[PDB]
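Example 916.
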Amino acid sequence: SALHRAADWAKSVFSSAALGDPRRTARLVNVAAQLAKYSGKSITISSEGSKAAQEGAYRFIRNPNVSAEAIRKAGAMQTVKLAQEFPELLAIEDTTSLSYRHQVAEELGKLGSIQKASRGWWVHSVLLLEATTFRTVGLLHQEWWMRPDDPADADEKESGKWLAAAATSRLRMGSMMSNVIAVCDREADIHAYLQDKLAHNERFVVRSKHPRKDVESGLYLYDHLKNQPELGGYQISIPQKGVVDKRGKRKNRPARKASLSLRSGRITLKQGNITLNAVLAEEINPPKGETPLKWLLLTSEPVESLAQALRVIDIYTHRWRIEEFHKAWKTGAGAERQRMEKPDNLERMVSILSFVAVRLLQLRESFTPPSQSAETVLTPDECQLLGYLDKGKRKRKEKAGSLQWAYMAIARLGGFMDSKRTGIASWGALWEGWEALQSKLDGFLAAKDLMAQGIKIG
Amino acid sequence: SALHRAADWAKSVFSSAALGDPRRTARLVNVAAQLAKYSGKSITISSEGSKAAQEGAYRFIRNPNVSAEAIRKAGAMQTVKLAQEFPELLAIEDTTSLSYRHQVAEELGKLGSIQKASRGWWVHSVLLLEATTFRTVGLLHQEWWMRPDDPADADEKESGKWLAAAATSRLRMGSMMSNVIAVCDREADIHAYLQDKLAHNERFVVRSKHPRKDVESGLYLYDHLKNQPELGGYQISIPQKGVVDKRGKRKNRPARKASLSLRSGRITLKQGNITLNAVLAEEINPPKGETPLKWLLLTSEPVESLAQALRVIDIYTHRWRIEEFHKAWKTGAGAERQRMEKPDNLERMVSILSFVAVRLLQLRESFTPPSQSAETVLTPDECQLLGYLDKGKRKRKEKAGSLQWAYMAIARLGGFMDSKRTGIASWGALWEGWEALQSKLDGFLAAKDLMAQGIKIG
DNA sequence: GACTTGTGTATAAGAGTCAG
DNA sequence: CTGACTCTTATACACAAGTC
DNA sequence: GACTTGTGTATAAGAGTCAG
DNA sequence: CTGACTCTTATACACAAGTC
Ligand SMILES: [Mg+2]
Ligand SMILES: [Mg+2]
Ligand SMILES: [Mg+2]
Ligand SMILES: [Mg+2]
Ligand SMILES: [Mn+2]
Ligand SMILES: [Mn+2]
Ligand SMILES: [Mn+2]
Ligand SMILES: [Mn+2]
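Predicted structure in complex with manganese (II) ion:
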């Protein structure tokens, strides 16, 4: 694991970039490390006062000989490298936009109405997770494009995104593709997409949107499914949250436990006369005034038993990870905070950030246990200092010196107060905590050094 | 000076609050220290994981027995205390708004159109500076109010703000009022205001807005002034900046040197037949396409010689400090980032922040020299660590171990790269640097401690 | 003296944000 | 697109420490 | 070998933000 | 309300270190 040490991390992710000059590759690694060390901050701040590094970083982000595609490819190859270690993987796939309003926006693509000031890119990503513990492995692919003002000018239909993602995946994963399960939201409810996966014997979990007919029974998927015997079901704890509409009316969404029934079955679609499985999760005795929870999922996976169908549900529930990634890239890494003047420059910088973003998520996961000493992830110095810092804050529930303790102590460092008592700290708080730990390490290490050379302190 | 040590700072500013219970007073001090230590962050983060402190802080901000007015008064009394030390003071006076859009906004006052979602308060402040070195002393007064949707419902004209500010000032400053020079923008070009100052024999510098006539010559102030002989003049370096209009068109404002002529004279206004002086600064051979620089200032101060008139100009140029304060309160302390649910709660919290804001400015000023050792402001440990940290970053121009060095080293810590080569770091960068210093101090001090108890490190 | 009010610890949840 | 949090405002108890 | 391209140091300034 | 900055993109030189 090259994660905690930014520099090592950077090297692991980008050392193989094929930029056409070993010098650009080394710079990319260096640029990425500083950004990673100063997650979310500006290039300048990341430079720690080094003129040369600052100049180096800017020169690189505007280097017309550096391909952003090649930079994203490099990091993707590392994900592939890492993926060899797991028998089953989840390929989470979704689209987001990168929005800007500064001068360059004029040179970017449409995101809303033709007149909107905010313009930028649509980015279709594939986020790989290991299917046993669901940890985040890394990005596998990104497709970036600018939507034209006039659809007529489009080079191709955007719906082809899924398929291009699959082609890239399959080619980067080679013989590992068989261990991959593609996870997509309703937008992927495209028969052409389904056909293709099936044709390659590839795996997937796609939520259904359209009313489709089941060839055998001739009923609509939903109906055919309602006819299937209940397998059992499951419960979900829906947490409280405040809600605001399009108009800005605010209202509360109190917490609640939802009970769902689970049914599954085999279906067949006319298109290519393809066969696949389906699962239907639907809320029983839904509240008086709430929109019932309902998921109709299409899949390649087994669904016969309650266990197999629930497995499908668990898989689809992991799709949300990509949403966290979106936020980590934006709010976390600062994707939309960048102010490069030319599309290509901004693209280069932002591409690097996509990796920083995945790291933000991994950091947290690294502190998340499945009683494993904290010494497994931290240095002895990190340990010592942390202990010092946490003095007296440890709760009974936390085994002294454990991985669990390190997690809370770091979060605490980050301000975490477990307000809802879930025990779960945000990836933002954890980063905040780690950042503080690291900062304080510098001071600690500075003292240590001075003593080592017989120097008196203060 | 109780500035650098947050706690001591808090005590100095608020220890005399008259809250009706010594317990609320001690809490206020404590609340303020944590906020000051964690400038700009949330109450929770400021709590360093302490449930009791967090609970204490919230309880206080919603305590119906705590008067926000009393909290602002307390800090103002400290400014008064401090003011005794200077022979001449500048009372900078201006209005800003505090804007919110969350649920409470409905309970706040109008700031724009009757329908605007953003509502909140208008706050008229007096910011005291020492007139020799222009350092920031502190806040002297704040008047907060909610503007009614219908003017008809207003309790009084908002124009009375200046006068109420003067009444409060005079009463808090007592015999020191004579050393005070009131500094106000054109909005203060109110004859009733002028009369009042004059009547109390009080001093001021008010920019002129309206065309007024000079009783003696019977010409308009501007004209009468143009007739006065030129005293000499002055130059200004107008720096480059990007500019954006109301509509969002962006355009450059390149740097330039402006040459101004200076004239002065005595004038008399019909209202109360009052006499006062005036100065007129007007740009000579102004550029082809720029809006000419022009200041017509009304004052109590001497204007006869070039020196005396320039003095007036320098004074008025210091008005901008209040603008920095506005930003420090908002962007810096987080005034508008607060999300308290009731007007009174938000008011209490935000009132505390106004002091935090002044401190942000003072911090910087504290590192600003007029070759005074850094040891005058920093601890030996702070010094040592800082030196360690800055290793190799010092520029020749900076005398090793000086106040000047500490300034740059801290700024550097804050990311400063002197992009425009002015040599001046923002108050934001300086805080960032100080914050880092402090953070790193914790680690340093933690090491020091451990050694002291024979413990091996890492 | 007779009553309130704050604190440190507990429990719980509404309000607000940026991802959808 | 079946969310995941933090900020903010309560509630309760056994004291402490305030007011009038 | 014959030409480009990056680096560390320099100089300068346009673009963008939140205060007005 | 006569702004004060940081972020970002150049320019130039003497080398170094790349490509083809
Ligand atoms: Mg295989
Ligand atoms: Mg931080
Ligand atoms: Mg006097
Ligand atoms: Mg900071
Ligand atoms: Mn989607
Ligand atoms: Mn004003
Ligand atoms: Mn999405
Ligand atoms: Mn103003």
